[PDB]
Amino acid sequence: KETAAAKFERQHMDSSTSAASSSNYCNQMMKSRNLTKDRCKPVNTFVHESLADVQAVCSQKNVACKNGQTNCYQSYSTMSITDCRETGSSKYPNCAYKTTQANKHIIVACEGNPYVPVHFDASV
16 A cells, blocks of 8 residues: 555645646646546645655644644645646546646645655645
């Protein structure tokens, strides 16, 4: 099985671009990151910053997670992100996503030693 940290990296990291290229960014990325394999993952955020910068969020502002856990952290600075969400015409295996590029603070839950992101909670 995938470690929690590796799954976060696969689902949420895109350090190769500074921002979403086009309207087709999400369709391309959701597919290549294997998030459309058995089903269409309905919502997924990619972060366009270095892994180091995202990992550093675990030592930033400690905040509650949406679910009530206390191991979430909000980035002090805004980061380049792309929100990917299924559209109305999306039907597995023909997954279709809307691509929304933005610059926001990210909030992640962190766990482990080393203490690293294991879940993407939200952006603000």
